Structure 1
Amino acid sequence: VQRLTYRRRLSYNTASNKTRLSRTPGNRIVYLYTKKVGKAPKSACGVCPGRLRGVRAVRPKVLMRLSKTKKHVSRAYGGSMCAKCVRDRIKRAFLIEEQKIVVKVLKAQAQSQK
């Protein structure tokens, strides 16, 4: 079998020296130095363990040359927060603001007595 050699002077099996096999048009097998596996964003909620949908998973400096649509989702907090926790915060914001109106009404009616 045809055995392989590194193509760079880094001779150690480090996290930056990862390769894959490739057959060239010259019918020889060579190393191709792969890029690291990118990660999708985690949600800003800090609760949901899954990563965000609709966002391309690339290394951080690749995001500079990606277009805007590939990095977010068309929604409030889109591309930074999960849809589930956005729904929860919309309801939580509304209901707590309602509760403030409750205590304001309750205190205003209870102060009618001198």
Structure 2
Amino acid sequence: VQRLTYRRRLSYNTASNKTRLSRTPGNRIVYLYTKKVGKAPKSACGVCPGRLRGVRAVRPKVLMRLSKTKKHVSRAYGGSMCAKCVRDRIKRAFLIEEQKIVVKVLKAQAQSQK
């Protein structure tokens, strides 16, 4: 049995000071200091609760190191918005734009008769 101490001077069980038991090649249990569970990024639409796919769930200041391809998925609004609410904002971006041309054509009627 290995009753073992902290290696830092933070003596409190705080958000920063969270550990894991790690057996060593000297054959003794000791604490390694676990980096926090950095989460995946979230969609810019902000409706889908499930976080993004193809982007690493990692601490935010780590992403300086990560390559471009680790950080975004290869698509328009890739790594910023969920693909489901991309293809709803492609249709709407077109079907609303189609509806504008029906207004452009119905305006070419109501004045030619007076």
Class of the TM-score when normalised by the shorter of the 2 chains: over 0.9
Deviations 1:21-65 (A, max 9, x none): 000001000000010001100100010001000000110110001
Deviations 1:2-29 (A, max 9, x none): 2110011000000000000000001000
Distance 1:11 1:22 in 2: 19
TM-score, length of structure 2 as denominator length: 0.98
Q: Displacement of 1:112 after TM fit?
A: 1.2
More helix by share: 1
- Structure 2 residue matching 1:108: 3-state secondary structure: coil
- Structure 2 residue matching 1:85: 3-state secondary structure: coil
Distance 2:63 2:57 in 1: 9
Distance 2:2 2:49 in 1: 44
Q: Displacement of 1:104 after TM fit?
A: 1.1
Runs (4+) of structure 1 exceeding 2 A deviation are: none
- Structure 1 residue matching 2:107: 3-state secondary structure: helix
TM-score, length of structure 1 as denominator length: 0.98
Q: Alignment identity in percent?
A: 100
Aligned residues: 114
Q: Displacement of 1:84 after TM fit?
A: 0.5
Distance 2:55 2:73 in 1: 7
Give the gaps of 5 or more residues in structure 1: none
